[PDB]
Amino acid sequence: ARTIRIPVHMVETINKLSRTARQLQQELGREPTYEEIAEAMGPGWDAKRVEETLKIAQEPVSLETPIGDEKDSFYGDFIPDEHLPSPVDAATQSLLSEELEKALSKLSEREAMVLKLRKGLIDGEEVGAFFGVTRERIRQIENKALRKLKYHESRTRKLRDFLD
Amino acid sequence: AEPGIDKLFGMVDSKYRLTVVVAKRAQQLLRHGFKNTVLEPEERPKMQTLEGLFDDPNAVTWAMKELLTGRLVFGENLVPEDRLQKEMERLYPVE
Amino acid sequence: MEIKRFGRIREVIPLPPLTEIQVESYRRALQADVPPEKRENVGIQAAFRETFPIEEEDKGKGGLVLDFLEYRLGEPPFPQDECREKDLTYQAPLYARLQLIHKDTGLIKEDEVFLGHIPLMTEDGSFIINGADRVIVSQIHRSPGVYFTPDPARPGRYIASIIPLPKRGPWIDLEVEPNGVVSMKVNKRKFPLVLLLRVLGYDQETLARELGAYGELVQGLMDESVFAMRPEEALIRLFTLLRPGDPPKRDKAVAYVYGLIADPRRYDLGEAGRYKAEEKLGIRLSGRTLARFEDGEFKDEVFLPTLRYLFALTAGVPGHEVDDIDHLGNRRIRTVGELMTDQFRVGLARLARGVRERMLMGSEDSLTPAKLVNSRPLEAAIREFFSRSQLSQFKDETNPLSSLRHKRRISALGPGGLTRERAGFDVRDVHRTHYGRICPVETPEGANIGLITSLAAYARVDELGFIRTPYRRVVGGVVTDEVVYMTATEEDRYTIAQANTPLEGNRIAAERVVARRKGEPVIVSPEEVEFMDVSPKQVFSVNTNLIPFLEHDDANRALMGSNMQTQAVPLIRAQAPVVMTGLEERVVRDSLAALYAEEDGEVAKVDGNRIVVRYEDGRLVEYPLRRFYRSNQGTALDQRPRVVVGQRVRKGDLLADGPASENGFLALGQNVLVAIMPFDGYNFEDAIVISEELLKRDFYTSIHIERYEIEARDTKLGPERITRDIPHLSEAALRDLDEEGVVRIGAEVKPGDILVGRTSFKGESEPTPEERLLRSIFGEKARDVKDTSLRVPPGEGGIVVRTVRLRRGDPGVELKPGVREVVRVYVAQKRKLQVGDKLANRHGNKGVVAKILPVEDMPHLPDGTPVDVILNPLGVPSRMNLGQILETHLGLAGYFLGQRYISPIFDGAKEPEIKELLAQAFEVYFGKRKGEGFGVDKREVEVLRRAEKLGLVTPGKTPEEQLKELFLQGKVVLYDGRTGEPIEGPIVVGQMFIMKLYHMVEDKMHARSTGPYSLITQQPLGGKAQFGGQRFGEMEVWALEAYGAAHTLQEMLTLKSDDIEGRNAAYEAIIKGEDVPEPSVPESFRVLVKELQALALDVQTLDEKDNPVDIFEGLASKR
Amino acid sequence: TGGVAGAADITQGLPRVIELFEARRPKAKAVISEIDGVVRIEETEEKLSVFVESEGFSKEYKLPKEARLLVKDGDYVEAGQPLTRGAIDPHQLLEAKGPEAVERYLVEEIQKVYRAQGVKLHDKHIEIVVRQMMKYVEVTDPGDSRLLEGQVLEKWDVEALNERLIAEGKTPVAWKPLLMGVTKSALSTKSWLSAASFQNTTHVLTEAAIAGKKDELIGLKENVIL
Amino acid sequence: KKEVRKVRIALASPEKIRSWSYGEVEKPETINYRTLKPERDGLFDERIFGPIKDYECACGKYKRQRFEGKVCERCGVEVTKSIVRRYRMGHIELATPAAHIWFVKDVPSKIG
Amino acid sequence: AFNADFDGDQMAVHVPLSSFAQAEARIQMLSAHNLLSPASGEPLAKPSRDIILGLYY
Amino acid sequence: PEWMILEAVPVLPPDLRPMVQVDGGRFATSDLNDLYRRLINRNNRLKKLLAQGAPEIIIRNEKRMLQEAVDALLDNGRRGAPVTNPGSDRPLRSLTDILSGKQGRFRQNLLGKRVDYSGRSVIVVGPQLKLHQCGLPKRMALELFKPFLLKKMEEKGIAPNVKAARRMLE
Amino acid sequence: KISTSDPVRQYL
Ligand SMILES: CCCC/C(C)=C/C=C(\C)C(=O)c1c(O)cc(CCC/C=C/NC(=O)OC)oc1=O
Ligand SMILES: [Mg+2]
Ligand SMILES: [Zn+2]
Fold this sequence. Notes:
The structure is cut from a larger assembly and holds two copies of chain A, one copy of chain B, one copy of chain C and four copies of chain D. Chain A is an all-alpha fold. Chain A has helices at about 10-30, 35-40, 45-55, 85-105, 110-120, 125-130, 135-155; one strand at about 60. Chain A folds into two domains: about 5-60, Winged helix-like DNA-binding domain superfamily/Winged helix DNA-binding domain (Arc Repressor Mutant, subunit A, Orthogonal Bundle), CATH 1.10.10.10; about 85-160, Winged helix-like DNA-binding domain superfamily/Winged helix DNA-binding domain (Arc Repressor Mutant, subunit A, Orthogonal Bundle). Chain A has seven helices and one strand, in the order αααβαααα. In chain A, α1 (about 10-30) crosses α2 and α2 packs across α3. Chain B is about 45% helix and about 0% strand. In chain B, α2 (about 15-30) crosses α3 (about 60-65). Chain B is flat. Chain D has two domains: about 1-25 and about 90-225, no CATH class; about 25-90, CATH 2.40.50.100. Chain D is about 35% helix and about 15% strand. Chain D has nine helices and eight strands. Chain D has a four-stranded antiparallel beta sheet, with no helix packed on it. In chain D, β1 and β2 form a beta hairpin. The interface of D and F includes residues 120, 121, 122 and 125 of D. The complex binds Myxopyronin B, magnesium ion and zinc ion (ZN). Chain D: DNA-dependent RNA polymerase catalyzes the transcription of DNA into RNA using the four ribonucleoside triphosphates as substrates. Chain D: The RNAP catalytic core consists of 2 alpha, 1 beta, 1 beta' and 1 omega subunit. When a sigma factor is associated with the core the holoenzyme is formed, which can initiate transcription.
């Protein structure tokens, strides 16, 4: 029946909510506050539960519905894009990588590339970060190169203007 | 209107040729570098915050001003397609 | 000041209650004010009675009888204002008494069941559905009665038509095609017109001789004798004619349906349908329609008269039976009440449907309350009508007058049953009957023309929607005050006259004097004048009646005038017109703008927020004043006092003025001295030049307000906290974010300031591998929450004047699911008059300010007083509205005479009276000039030289006598101001009233560089902090196509809109001063190709030599 | 234009310019003379009759009661000449005088409207349009494809020229000048792209598909899509 | 690299249907709520139509650009941003054929 | 040329981005270069409503 | 001609038939997905009906449903009209009609692209202005020529760079 | 025609 699949429990669950609802309206003349649905339902029913269920039960909206005056208005034109980098973003990652790459080459590859690749290439642990050299030379170059890099970047303020 | 537009129209066989020439000329005026022009001498492009149009305001306004002179040459097949870009790179430096 | 109104027309009766249409239509719709012992039983109670006696007898066990006792609704859940603060629908609760009977000993009466929450009306006449005040518009259609009409294909003879509404209910037609057939159709297929009569009891001999002796067509009736010789068997025979393959036996079942109850209608017995009967055809109708179920033998006083008249209509002149459908006696108006009663009925049917099922479901006898009633149908039904009905719309309160209009405008379009948009040109035009019933001017410019329109001045809906209107009774050559509200139809029977007819009191004064029989202008004698028009006013609408000399203005551009006032924006400085028609006063009173006094008394306290008056009755009440309230559209509605402390009050005297009233008078815009000449080009086709001096004074200025909202949402990534905390850069922005979170009241918010702050989380736990490095480097300030904060959208904001913070929901507010909390922020701003604005007089002269000139150099009069606005003459000849040139004249007088006047619609001021007032003016203008010490300029004489050579001044007279002449013509001498020299030739000037028009959301001058894009179609898309692109349509493509704009057009289709990689490399290139790349394929195409591939079609691009090329760069190949 | 009632004879305004660009049946059609000869008329009660005849032959044409005849018993009437009063159907005028006549009838009778209202547009423009109303021709003596077919005129000047100039093989392609209204002219053109643009696109495609139609990009709409 | 000069519509051979396609859509499940992610093998399935997340894979075994184009082992994923998701085609194979309504019901039934 | 009066008619505005696009834009699409109508070889830059009125008097 | 009969139904891309997060917990998806399910479910139920055992009235009954569904995604409405569920007795949009709506007869139904460097405001007579020019609001010129300005910003001391210049004008 | 009736007719 639905677009988003829902297991047979959320189904018999949600049906009881609506069932319980109808019965509740029979009394109050007040579309029950979620407080009253929790009760009526039973053992572990609480507001947070009814609210959620009433949300999952909310089927999707048709991406293509007659909008505003019905004339000729589809609903999809109104939804913005979220992965695709609007030009502002393409420009950002241009300079960012252009100059993030300049700093990477001018630094000692030992602990800079370590933290650049163990944080930037694939996902990445201090001790397990450096090849053969232990943590005393990691922390050593990490924190000393990272600050020299940051304090000169302080002089020639390129990075200061927080890129994103 | 814009400088000797008629004079310009008269140089070409077709209206749409004067548009192609100027547009491509402005293209290269930027690409190889901006001094590619033939007319820096005594009187050339100018702007007033300071007179500095001498460097890079409108490419196209130049192209027209040069074409209005008889130095440029626009043909259907003047110089072999790929070989030009090569020799223009060689001779006109700040790219 | 003072007031003089010209040439009277004996006003016989005052204008009716204006919002009456919507106000009391809901009165007779729901009768809550008076219990069920009161007789008015239409609407709700009617609808109720209509579907309550639910008879369900046998299929298993039955004999069910649920009966209605009394309907009673009374205690509103919440109040009006709270309904707007909180999103709430102001509705009254309704529970009627119900008692179900049993075939077994017992009748359980379970008294109440609150089903259906039905909205209530505001005292003004507008609703409140969800946060916004809404209005129910009226409609028009074919009223239920029998009519007869011609035949278009075959020029021969016309056919009859029986029209029964509701929809469920047959629709009959009688047509005769003599080679051997007669046609009578109910749903569709025809049958003998006689087979039916025979069924009812009309035999060939009694029928043919009495009905058609004078009608030879009777021969078609007695034709198929074989069947006409068996009565009751004909009943079954016809049964057989309809076709399912049904049981011959069904005693009196289907004959019942075209008999008494359902299909024909329950419209009130007596006047609803029987009206269209006795006058049009067939004289009697008791029992609602062709109805009877007493002996099994049916009676039809309607079936024979219809043919009767077709025989008659075809034969000669019984009367001339031709029905002009567009006769208002045929096209009825649906007032609000009816609109609801119908949806209320639809719900009742939906209710009565489910209940029928539960008469079998309930085990034994206790089944009265829950077993028979369920409130979710009536709820969804009615609720859908006030919130989704195409008919109910946002109230348009740009300014009161507006709402009033929108309160009473009759639209075509609607139910769909009446008039869809397909047809129109016959409906769209103005009909002879539209007189005093519908304005001929109010319709909307545009596609939707003539179909949507507001009603007239005195025009009012008699009990059943037939726009009728008042008319006096002239007996012989004697006129009277007994006014008859005459239906559209009866009006044709009499010879009516116009009010303009010279009158001494009760006497008619000229032998040949105009009157109009039925839609046609007729010069009648004083002895034939049966009835007279009430007032010229009843001819048009309120909205139009506000125009000064309507009389001299082309009905076409007077419409513009009427619609323009509907766009009048309330100005902090409101002024009434120098010249008014006379309804200004009653518009603000029938509308509920100003606050009037109940009975007499004295004033106790006069706050800026309350006037607690104390009546002489020994009682005193506090009258709050909606200080600054937002109007649905964004105009200020402030009630500002006009009475001082301890003051006498007339019963019904203004205590406070409405949004736009000066002093009880309607006021929109301000009277300003205007010279009517050409300036440089500043007023070239329809431009207006304005004097800075107008801005110096706070003249054209108006206050605006807009509510910005933002929700704290509950994401599965972590609740969106709403705090003063704005994660990434400066406290300078946090200043005005005074209270932690929201912005402080009285703060100046400019585009791009935090109005409110909130915080959401982004990416999953690990956002950017590269940017995480940068953060560790420069300074690890890790607070992963995102800045999603309601900021001031481009375009502008002003000062914050009010804020509302509704947390999850403990008041009596229900928050939507997911919604953690809402935060609104009302902002207000002053809109000064500026060059972008547009002002227009009531006549129709519309235009935009092109230049604000320094009072230093615009046209100035001899005495140092300069002109405020300079209107271009040229705009007057083409259009035809001299009325504006007449207003300007009467104005000139009013300026020097320090008085205002009232020139009625067509009886008002008359050229001699105005030249007369100008005469009096000349003495105040030039008289003082004499005494003050000086005479006439070298300039003043010079212009007189170019005036006589022109022909405006009688040569030979003296300059002081010549200028009087010149002035009486309405024009005076004017000097440049920028040269001091005079303007060769007199130029008119004067007090013209001009209003300023409301700025739509369009006004906001859009401008977009780069910005969002659409998800599926990637084209520029308008957003929160970026404007959104302008459409390049076909017509515009061709424009470029026509030119040799090859690339410019490619650009518009690639780099600028769809070329995904294009626009990017485009931007960047520009950024470095490089040229934009040349276009990649447009997602436009790619979407098509695939959409095409979706279907079995294979679209493949090719090469030089028929060889595949690739549009989808490399994403389609499965190497 | 007009409405069925008594005798409404012509059509004015835009409605007409529509009736003209799309070769349509005027209500008040004027019977043209398929033959160029001399005139002869008759008196019987019900229907009139105008007879055109040459030393060769004669032809009768029914001219019902409303018919207001412009010609008189006596002189000559060129082919496709107005014999009735009023409007003319371009197709008839085509088959009578020829392409050369319809063409110039269409053009001028179209400017008849504009001129009357005030508009002064050069003939050039209406010509460009009308021209492409006749760009199509019907086949009656095949070579490559079956006879009844409607195909582009010069596309036949292609196959014809080549067939005849080279030894013919044997086929002189005999065609018939075809007239179609502007709306249909374009409805059926070379490039399916453009045809998909105009209304029928479900069909346009279907057939462009089956035939494996290759769209040579010439023309702006088809080329703008891409 | 070659100037597109001719476009051509032609019928789709069932073998070309599959030539264009990637994997079959064999189950009706859109997106399961708990994890808003392509579910069994249905309309959306990062392996049939493409990687939803920009350059990363589904399980996270492989995450960045350098190895651009190699596919994951437990969860099928070759990547370029979500766009390849947007252009790729999947197919369904019908039990017993049916036909195009476009060809069956067009005034002149191209099959009739 | 554009049927436009100043009663509120709003005009849209676009920007030529390539050097070519502007080349064509101002060479063959600028206003002052297209003075005579494509319909008739009769001027369209004809002194309108006020200019005549003036030059006449 | 053998191909006119369908046995392999091409499925339109996914990002072209999105599934998106709207507001609160509401999800919006392309109508097409409700039709696709239909097809998929019927196609599957078919297979399972063949293997389980096959009463032939039941196999044709579904082979029909299947056919109807195969129509639906392609073109809805040429025969019977599909509706998801009460709320919108609105024909589910369909491939065929998506394409059509594109260029079909209506005023421009859905015909026209929106340009990236545009803008519109109220016009006003510019008497002194020459044929040559036109008065444009600077405020408009700004986001119109924003990128063009950004770099000349950089070409002059006003701003160090491109992102600088951007926030400088935010 | 209308797919419910002929199936109903079919197995009924
Ligand atoms: C199978 C269908 C063929 C028809 C067709 C072109 C579809 C194009 C689609 C869906 C698009 O992506 C699309 C565009 O590329 C461009 C424009 C706006 C530009 C319009 C230019 C029109 N010129 C013209 O009519 O020239 C004579 O609208 C659009 O919707
Ligand atoms: Mg205008
Ligand atoms: Zn993986």
